[PDB]
Amino acid sequence: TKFPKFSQALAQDPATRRIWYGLATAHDLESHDGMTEENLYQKIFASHFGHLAVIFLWTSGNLFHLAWQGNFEQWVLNPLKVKPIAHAIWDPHFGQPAVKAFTKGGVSYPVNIATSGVYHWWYTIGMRSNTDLYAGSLFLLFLAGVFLFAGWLHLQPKFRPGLSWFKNNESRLNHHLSGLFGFSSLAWSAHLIHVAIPEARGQHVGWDNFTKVAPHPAGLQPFFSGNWGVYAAAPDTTNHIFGTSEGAGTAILTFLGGFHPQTQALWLTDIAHHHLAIGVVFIFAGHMYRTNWGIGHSLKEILDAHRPPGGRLGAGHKGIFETLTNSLHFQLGLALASLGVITSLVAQHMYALPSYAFIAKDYVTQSALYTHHQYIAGFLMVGAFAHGAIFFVRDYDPEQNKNNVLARILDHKEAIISHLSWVSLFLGFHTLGIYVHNDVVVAFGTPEKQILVEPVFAQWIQASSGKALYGFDVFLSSSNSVATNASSNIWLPGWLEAINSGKNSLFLPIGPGDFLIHHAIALALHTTTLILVKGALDARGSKLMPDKKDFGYSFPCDGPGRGGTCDISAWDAFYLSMFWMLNTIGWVTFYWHWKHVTIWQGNAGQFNESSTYIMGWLRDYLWLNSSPLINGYNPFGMNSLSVWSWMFLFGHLIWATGF
Amino acid sequence: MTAAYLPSILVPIIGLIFPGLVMAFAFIYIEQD
């Protein structure tokens, strides 16, 4: 048997365990038979090329399936009334009533209604027909083929890069900051100014005419003249109808703030100046490190020099340079942590400040997008801590990290874990106590005895951003403040109009239920962090198993001796923290969906009165909103929700099977 | 739908022929010495 060709020990297994473990360790290249560092890095480079190609193929498939079976050209004309089509349905297991019930969107065949919001995104960035959608799908197929060929080529001899190229921190940082971040943002600003904004103003710009259709009537003469503010003059009127010239402006770079009054999304000129400014800032950031010409910073010197002279951090950041460059798991943990933070940021800022036209009125799309990117965020953060634990098992050299910041984390890990345990028990005891207190006192007919804490800190923050609801009269909600006078000519009117109109999700009003659910979220975040940090810091050893690093990151147990050692590895701490991650994203998405559903219904007081006790969550959110879902099919008939009605039960099944 | 024959041609192939051939060849690959 030679299926796991990368593992001789697995290939000699006489049982069915061989197939499973060969499947489960296939991409764990560091543990393979005879793996060298150079071969490892080259295989990782080609695999990264392959994942890039997969992403491009998936996006091209979305574009193609929309250009072929969607209703994009119908949806562009009437964006608030036409249901966007994801793809067609051809399922031979359907009966005729299911064919009838899925025939929606103004077409004559069964379709799925898109919830990904690709219509709003593609319409906002200037796509109008099915032809340019198809052309984009072809271009992304070509790009995926190019990246597949590059992955093949950069594995061929005399093209395989050396380890010195892979561990070139300064050159990769300079190029990825200035070019991959900066010039990409500048080019996207160029696309918005050159294409997206004219198509938003009823003017077609394509490859056939973009060299003769000026983005601005004055041309590049104000840019080369230094009279840049000419590009801010004559912005879009509040009577502008999106995608038409009626009420359109001529500005390409503004700082208006707030939302377009019709699309309920950010101004495209604001987005263009944003991405231009981000490009300039990032290109300036990408000239920081020394690569070939004497100027620039050395990363090793910066790390070694930043030791505080009071000695509280010990040796400071000495040895962190080699520890991070030599460990791909350290790099992966840092990358996954930063990505998880930023996709959480994407989820919060995109519902609060939508950028795509008419997507704030697509409630299903907003709910799906928030839930999707928050679950992605939870997965990424769990992965960051897991691969940090893997770094402590596999790549942490203590002798290379003497009195380092990493060594001092390991030296006060007991204090860290004990204080995390204390703050988790603190939060859980009193948050659950307040909820149960409210439940009991409302059940006994006395809701006036509830413990309802007003979230005055976050309300004060909202007032500091200009929310006049709470009467705090500070910073932007004070008409005489220096912060108010400072921004009054640039963005304060549009921002104040957007924050003080109760027609959006910009700084939504909050009460005691919001207080309780954020403190529950704080509990869940601290507890998941407790499990993950305790797994990472005890990964090398504990009092129960002082030689744990000899056994690797993942192993079943150390036997029933010494009291019993079930789930003692750091992998098991990943496994335990996965349930807590699911629990916290569940709480966060439950809060988001219930608050937004009650607000969209015009019944926000239902959330304000029912969220302070758990029975309100169970009855007014779970039980109340389950009725159309569980009636997708019934003994009287079926409708288009039936698939979700199936999938719901499907989920309730497989979850139980996990048990 | 333009080229409406393509779902009825490709969906049975992709859903029954592709997994059958993949499962057969993967079975042969993982069980051969």
Partner: peptide
């Protein structure tokens, strides 16, 4: 809208990507 020829062109491009993906998979498999 999209024609049959355009779908065939997309299918040809996808077949080229399939050949390139098979070559990359064989290269990664050594």
């Amino acid at each position: 809208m999209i024609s049959d020829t355009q779908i065939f062109i997309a299918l040809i491009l996808a077949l080229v990507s399939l050949v390139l993906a098979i070559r990359l998979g064989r290269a990664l498999y050594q």
